[PDB]
Amino acid sequence: SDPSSINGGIVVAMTGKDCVAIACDLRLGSQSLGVSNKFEKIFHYGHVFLGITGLATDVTTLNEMFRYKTNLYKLKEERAIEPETFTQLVSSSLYERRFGPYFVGPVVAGINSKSGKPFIAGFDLIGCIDEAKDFIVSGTASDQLFGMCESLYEPNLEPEDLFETISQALLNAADRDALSGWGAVVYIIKKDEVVKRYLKMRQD
Amino acid sequence: NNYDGDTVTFSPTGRLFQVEYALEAIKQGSVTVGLRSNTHAVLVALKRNADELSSYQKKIIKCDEHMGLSLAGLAPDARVLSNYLRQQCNYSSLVFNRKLAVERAGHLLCDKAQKNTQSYGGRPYGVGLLIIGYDKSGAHLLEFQPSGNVTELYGTAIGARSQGAKTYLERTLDTFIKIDGNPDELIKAGVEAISQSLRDESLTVDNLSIAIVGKDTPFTIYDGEAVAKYI
Amino acid sequence: EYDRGVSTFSPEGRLFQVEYSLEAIKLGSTAIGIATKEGVVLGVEKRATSPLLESDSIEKIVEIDRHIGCAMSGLTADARSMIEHARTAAVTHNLYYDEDINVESLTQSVCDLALRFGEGASGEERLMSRPFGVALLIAGHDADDGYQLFHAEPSGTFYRYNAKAIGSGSEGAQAELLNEWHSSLTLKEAELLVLKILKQVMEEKLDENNAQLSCITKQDGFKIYDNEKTAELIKELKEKEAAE
Amino acid sequence: GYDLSNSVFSPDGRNFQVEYAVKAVENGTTSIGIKCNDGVVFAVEKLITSKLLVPQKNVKIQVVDRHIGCVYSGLIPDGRHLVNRGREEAASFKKLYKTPIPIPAFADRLGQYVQAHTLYNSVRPFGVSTIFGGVDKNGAHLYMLEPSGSYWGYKGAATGKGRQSAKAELEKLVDHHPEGLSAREAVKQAAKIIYLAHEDNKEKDFELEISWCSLSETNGLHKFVKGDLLQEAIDFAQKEIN
Amino acid sequence: GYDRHITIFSPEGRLYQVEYAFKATNQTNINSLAVRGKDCTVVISQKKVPDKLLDPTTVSYIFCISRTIGMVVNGPIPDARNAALRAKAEAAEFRYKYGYDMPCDVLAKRMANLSQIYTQRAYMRPLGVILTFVSVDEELGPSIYKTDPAGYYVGYKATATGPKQQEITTNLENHFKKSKIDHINEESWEKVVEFAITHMIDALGTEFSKNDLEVGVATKDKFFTLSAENIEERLVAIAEQ
Amino acid sequence: GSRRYDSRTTIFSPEGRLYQVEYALESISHAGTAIGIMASDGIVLAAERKVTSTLLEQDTSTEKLYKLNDKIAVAVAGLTADAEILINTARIHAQNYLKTYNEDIPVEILVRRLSDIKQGYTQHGGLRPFGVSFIYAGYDDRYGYQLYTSNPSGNYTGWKAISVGANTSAAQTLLQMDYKDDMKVDDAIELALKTLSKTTDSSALTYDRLEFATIRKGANDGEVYQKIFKPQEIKDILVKTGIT
Amino acid sequence: YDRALSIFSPDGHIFQVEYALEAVKRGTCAVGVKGKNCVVLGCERRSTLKLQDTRITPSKVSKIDSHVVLSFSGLNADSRILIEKARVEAQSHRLTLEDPVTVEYLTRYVAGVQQRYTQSGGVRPFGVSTLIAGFDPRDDEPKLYQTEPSGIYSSWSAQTIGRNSKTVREFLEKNYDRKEPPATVEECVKLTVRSLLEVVQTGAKNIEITVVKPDSDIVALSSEEINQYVTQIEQEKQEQQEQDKKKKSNH
Amino acid sequence: TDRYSFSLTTFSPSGKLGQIDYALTAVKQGVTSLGIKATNGVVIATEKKSSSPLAMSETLSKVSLLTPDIGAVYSGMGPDYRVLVDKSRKVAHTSYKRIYGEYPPTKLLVSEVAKIMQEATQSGGVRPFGVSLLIAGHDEFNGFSLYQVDPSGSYFPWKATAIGKGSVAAKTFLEKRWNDELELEDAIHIALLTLKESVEGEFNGDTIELAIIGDENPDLLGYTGIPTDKGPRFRKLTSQEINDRLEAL
């Protein structure tokens, strides 16, 4: 097998006009067997959103790894962590197991609370910052996703126009992908309000 | 106890009082007298019982087949040196297909004691050994003090009433050195020497212990019916 | 003090720490041991200090192995450490050689353990800053010397004994040992002789709730005599003082 | 008092524990060192305590490297351990650089070791002065090493009881030869000042030992003086002091 | 009583133990005078040779660290050898990991840090020596930085150390009042040596022989000691002045 | 030597009790008042700062209230400096549990772990302890609201109301005579304040020397909300209760 | 650190051991009495202090195994360490050997913790004496052992440790006979209540009772339950004093 | 062996800990330093005094840079400051420059060094540092802040404070002179006017070390065209700059 082709996973993320959106699929497989049509690969500490792709075990392993580190920051300094400061954190953390690594692709998405700007960032297994203000896509249909998201994308999107471009891009890659699909959930992340809305799609 | 319970300080007279104090441990022990000619070395130890139903304590330890050490101080302190001398003697056989010599072994042991007396929580050891053996260079008889001082002689003694033994040996000096190749006489001359280390306690077969090694003789420990010969 | 060291001297030429240990065998309960060539008998004062104490599951007899017995006297917190090490030594010897360990060799191992005070002498690991405070009566039967009985001090020195008594009543007990012991004694005349010497230095009355016998024999191993037999022997001794 | 350890210090610039340790060397045996053009000539008085003793069978001169004789006075077991320590450092230099160790270099290494015991509370310093020298590619040298881990160059040294007597005679000998003398000739002068310095030990009797490292005779390696050559030295000293 | 016996603060906020080190350099009778030139740093120091039976050319108080920075040691010589070994190693280490030789300033800070840990450790005695590092770098120019056993350092235009260093301090102070600068001006390095010797003969009132001085001169990109042969040219040349 | 200079302060006195445990209680009385009272809707922790000064900023200060984890925060009485080492052990510890069992730490484990750490420091090494006493406001789902005081040698004991710090005896008595088991957070706020007011070490009770924190179950979704009040919200309630 | 904190004393003593026995006199009192069908350990609970929520107060009797109970006297700070260590031991024996612990197995372990720091340098031993009681598995023999700060252990049929232990022991001589223990659970329970109401006092609040029975059954009997038993004890005591007054009048 | 693993800091019988009081004695016999917090910067300021007349003082930095935006200054002992300034710089790099690759909050940093102080009153071979520090700083997440570290290894936030042997005079001086808002210009004129009565001699710019953690300086940034990275908020004031402010009194 590959540690990175064993349960699929894709996370998409896009920017808009005064808002961000992140979204994932719900398909958690162990190889070719589908186990569940339910599993979030998206998590949140305060106003920063972590989608973690790859390896089954490493979704959980890195998630409580950042659970510990997020705590320390909030209890000491009495504030919730910023998107940019989180991205740096993740960069350094991935790099700690250089050899035999963390088997994941995290994707960092938020909207700052100190200036109110969208921020997105990407990572490999070893991890390197992949800055954009476009879109950050990661996973196994990350290739598929890169073409499809471009075709759609327009710099600056109204929060429910934004919702039309990401829903469509994610569903279409994900219903040509073997290890991913089975439902999808899109978050539209506004400065002070998130809606979590599921998408009806092919469950096949 | 400004320097008297302290194994790390000097000691206004260039001493350490603890080395002088470890030498009283030899006084409280028994006596052993060694003599060599050139073709044999001899240890004759006086063993000591703890009462008449108690056995006697062996005061000659065999280290090798060409080496033995005898104690006249504390027994648990004699157990350290014995282990160590035996390790280095077997090493010599295994690695260089060589035999170990007393002279060289006196220096390995010198340095071992020194570096424990340097340390705090250490001690200068409560024993003195005479180490005999017959090696590649002939007989050697070395006297090991709690200080670690090695000197090579034709006759020496350690323990109580040792001064009287050394009187014996200063007389018989040229007698015993010129008996060569007749092991009997040397051994009988160490019995009488140690008869001048007595208080008229006499010598029985279970107080008298001889061990010898020659050129042509193994290291062998004599006791019982094999010490009644030499009286 | 010259015990505030770990191996210090002490103008006398001997430790302080060792001397105190020997006066804490006077915190013991008398353990007497008569060695003969038909076995070795160990008798011990169990000591019963309350009628609310369960005293028949209290013995100062301890099994090293089947062919080696030990009886301890003194401070018994120190003794748990010494008897555990001996049980392993015996078992190690049967591992490496499939053989019965010398009583002499076993006694010697437990002396090697006894020297561990220091923190800068020698060339081994130090897990004590003080010596032991307990003495052993190691009996056993080996096929090279026959039956043997050894007395080990917490100094790290040991003697083979025909008969020894250590404990609180050690001075008066050994005084009788010198006069009454002979080599014409056997397993059973030795056995009633123990109970006679123990009887003087007994502080309650000689009874089967303060006294325990055990032998070590070749043909049966280590057998700790049941209370019915221990009680019998106590009565047939008294009948030979009724015969005076 | 300031002798409780050695991380105590007095305002005096002195430390008391270290001062006491030189007092052990001051009852030691006479040991001298004569610096010569070709080499060095060491000689040491070996006290004959008894007639049981074997003369010239125990040496206080133990060789270090192949060309540095080291000879010590003070506490004999202690000095034998310090000399043992500098043989491990000499073998490390020969393994590592494929050349014998320089005398100034070997002198430096010893100083460090003895320096160290006067810093840490938990070790007992050295109580010996060592007299050492040899011939290398930096030339012939002579060095004396204090219990305090100090050395300097020397053209005459002494240590022991008779350290006063020896020094006084070595000064008249550098005024005799202010352009220096042979190592072969210094055999005869080594004995002489031992005879003169055995008038501080004229309660006792002595055995004469001499050792040399000379470029002129033994091809720059440290060897012993013994046999008829030693006895010329015995005879030289004998006829002058009588 | 333990604040004069190991290193804990007295009720006065001090460490006498630290103090006792500074009083030890003054029993060895060595004085030094160190001046910055214009193309050099000069350091001149006492040597004592009291016996015929001491060798003069072996005995030294100027110990060569770097090939730019010399080190002049005032006070007890066991502690000197330990510090020279440690100071050379550290300069070599810097050459090895940074690809240029340690600046003077920074060599002074590394030994200063080390001196402060030995006075923090109570089972460890500090250095009793006062170390002056002298150099000519081309990062800084002529330099003097003097570290002490306390762990304190500062740069200097000039300095003296020893029991009698208050007399040398007066002569040197007057010399920078008159010149109106913080370093000596001269375009020969030889002459900067000679002014330094003049001011020492004046301060202590004693004239020097060639075997009671040991002179170190750092010129541009080398440090060297003058041999007793070269010191004698300088001491004749002070009369010519 | 090295033994010369030894503290020997981690041993017992003939009282069977350490020199260092006793010393620590004196200094916890030097330190400013911290009190816990347990309401049936929460736990009030109320701490008076040890210092107050003219130019001192007490308005970015939270020098007595610390979050160990989200549902467990503490009040501190003792040395401030000392308390901070134990604070970051407790943070690690809490997260480690959350890390491995995916569940918030019970209060019971959390108090005990800190008790052990203080206990090691008194046991061996010649080490000093951290002479701090914590008053733990904690919630767990297996016993509701739980309240605890801890002592310098690390021991925990349950309470319904307790005071440690300055004028402890006087304070603790006002708390016992008023206490009802039916008290709510509003009452508990006023009682705590009045008790602090009668034992103040200045001449009044003011927002700038007060820290106030509560844990409320009256908060959204019936959950426990830790709220550490701003000095202006401390000012607000002070004016309602009429001290200022 | 290897500097001794336990040394041989000049009395043939250890310093630390005299001190440790004194820390156990100043602490809490646990009385141990064994039945013919149970063991019962009642211990004094501190709840003299006013205003204490007792649900959260750590009990002074802690189960180590499903059928082995542990009680203690002395420093309470020091005691948690023995209880914490014992739990790990119980489960370690199931892990590697099969079976729960025996009482004998824990009796030697706890004695070895106290012993080790006595003999060792750079360590003092705890001020803690413990009662290990319970049953062995696939047995129904009541086991009552006592371990002490020296590293010594002994068996008992009834025992008591802690404060005014002398007073308790003297009562128990005439009321606990080695031959016939109490044959019922209630009378065994009730003997421990009678000792406790001497020293502890103050209702059933400060009194605790733990019963352990054969085949893994530990039940904790609450204060409330204990009150029932007091009232019977008070009528039994009062009535027995009355019939002594009437015989004494006549005689 | 080692046996120096017992504490050199221990409790006194009638409370407190005696060893950290002795260390602070070195601060009130030390050199004097002060800090006024403005609403637009902090000034921190100190006195230099020579060991010899032939010594320099521009070879000594009594105010040192920990990171571009957070500076530190001491009262107490010199030696103790030399070593501790390096440990602070080193911990500011291991723990926010390998982990977040930015400069740490000022509240956090003060905490971390107080840990070093706290674990230097623990175990043998270490007795505390003879300084109290001011760690003046700016972060962007808590604004301007001022702290005083004690040898306790405790910290306190301040609105304006002083430490050294004129501490007692100085905080009383600042009581009239400080106000809720202050301009930075005027904060400099207050800080010198305070340090004027606390020096016994020279008061030039070559004797007074002045540094501001005022506002960002795009000329000490050493790169341009990145407008997300602000210039160093610290700026040490050279002698000529200080001399001007002398004339403004």
Swiss-Prot record, chain B:
Entries under PANTHER family matching the protein: PROTEASOME SUBUNIT ALPHA/BETA (PTHR11599)
Subcellular location: Cytoplasm; Nucleus
GO process terms (BP): proteasomal ubiquitin-independent protein catabolic process; proteasome-mediated ubiquitin-dependent protein catabolic process
Keywords on record: Cytoplasm, Isopeptide bond, Nucleus, Phosphoprotein, Proteasome, Ubl conjugation
Residue location of crosslink Glycyl lysine isopeptide (Lys-Gly) (interchain with G-Cter in ubiquitin): 188
Function: The proteasome degrades poly-ubiquitinated proteins in the cytoplasm and in the nucleus. It is essential for the regulated turnover of proteins and for the removal of misfolded proteins. The proteasome is a multicatalytic proteinase complex that is characterized by its ability to cleave peptides with Arg, Phe, Tyr, Leu, and Glu adjacent to the leaving group at neutral or slightly basic pH. It has an ATP-dependent proteolytic activity.
Miscellaneous: Present with 7210 molecules/cell in log phase SD medium.
Assembly description: The 26S proteasome consists of a 20S proteasome core and two 19S regulatory subunits. The 20S proteasome core is composed of 28 subunits that are arranged in four stacked rings, resulting in a barrel-shaped structure. The two end rings are each formed by seven alpha subunits, and the two central rings are each formed by seven beta subunits. The catalytic chamber with the active sites is on the inside of the barrel.
An example Gene Ontology CC term for this record: proteasome complex
Domain of life: Eukaryota
N-terminal signal peptide: none
Modified residues (Phosphoserine): 11
Protein name per UniProt: Proteasome subunit alpha type-6
Name of encoding gene: PRE5
Curated annotation (Swiss-Prot), chain C:
Consequence recorded when altering residue 43 to D: In DOA5-1; slight decrease in activity
Disulfide-linked positions: none
Protein name in UniProt: Proteasome subunit alpha type-5
Its job: The proteasome degrades poly-ubiquitinated proteins in the cytoplasm and in the nucleus. It is essential for the regulated turnover of proteins and for the removal of misfolded proteins. The proteasome is a multicatalytic proteinase complex that is characterized by its ability to cleave peptides with Arg, Phe, Tyr, Leu, and Glu adjacent to the leaving group at neutral or slightly basic pH. It has an ATP-dependent proteolytic activity.
Record NCBIfam families: PRK03996.1
Transmembrane regions listed in the UniProt entry: none
Gene3D superfamilies linked: Glutamine Phosphoribosylpyrophosphate, subunit 1, domain 1
Modification type Phosphoserine: residues: 50
UniProtKB/Swiss-Prot annotation, chain D:
GO molecular function, one term: mRNA binding
Keyword DNA damage (UniProt): no
Keywords: Acetylation, Cytoplasm, Nucleus, Proteasome
Keyword flag Methyltransferase: no
Modifications the protein undergoes after translation, according to the UniProt entry: The alpha and beta forms are probably products of the same gene with different post-translational modifications.
Top-rank taxon, per record: Eukaryota
Annotated GO biological process: proteasomal ubiquitin-independent protein catabolic process; proteasome-mediated ubiquitin-dependent protein catabolic process
A GO cellular-component term linked to this record: nucleus
Protein localization: Cytoplasm; Nucleus
Subunit structure: The 26S proteasome consists of a 20S proteasome core and two 19S regulatory subunits. The 20S proteasome core is composed of 28 subunits that are arranged in four stacked rings, resulting in a barrel-shaped structure. The two end rings are each formed by seven alpha subunits, and the two central rings are each formed by seven beta subunits. The catalytic chamber with the active sites is on the inside of the barrel.
Family designation: Belongs to the peptidase T1A family.
Misc: Present with 12000 molecules/cell in log phase SD medium.
Record protein name field: Probable proteasome subunit alpha type-7
Source organism (scientific name): Saccharomyces cerevisiae (strain ATCC 204508 / S288c)
Span within the parent record: 7 to 248 of 288
From Swiss-Prot, chain H:
A family per Pfam: Proteasome
Superkingdom to which the source organism belongs: Eukaryota
Record cross-link Glycyl lysine isopeptide (Lys-Gly) (interchain with G-Cter in ubiquitin), residues: 107
Keywords: Cytoplasm, Isopeptide bond, Nucleus, Proteasome, Ubl conjugation
Principal location class: cytoplasm
Localisation per UniProt entry: Cytoplasm; Nucleus
GO cellular component, one term: proteasome core complex, alpha-subunit complex
Biological process terms in GO annotation: proteasomal ubiquitin-independent protein catabolic process; proteasome-mediated ubiquitin-dependent protein catabolic process
Biological role stated in the UniProt entry: The proteasome degrades poly-ubiquitinated proteins in the cytoplasm and in the nucleus. It is essential for the regulated turnover of proteins and for the removal of misfolded proteins. The proteasome is a multicatalytic proteinase complex that is characterized by its ability to cleave peptides with Arg, Phe, Tyr, Leu, and Glu adjacent to the leaving group at neutral or slightly basic pH. It has an ATP-dependent proteolytic activity.
Assembly information from the UniProt record: The 26S proteasome consists of a 20S proteasome core and two 19S regulatory subunits. The 20S proteasome core is composed of 28 subunits that are arranged in four stacked rings, resulting in a barrel-shaped structure. The two end rings are each formed by seven alpha subunits, and the two central rings are each formed by seven beta subunits. The catalytic chamber with the active sites is on the inside of the barrel.
Name of this protein: Proteasome subunit alpha type-2
Species, as recorded: Saccharomyces cerevisiae (strain ATCC 204508 / S288c)
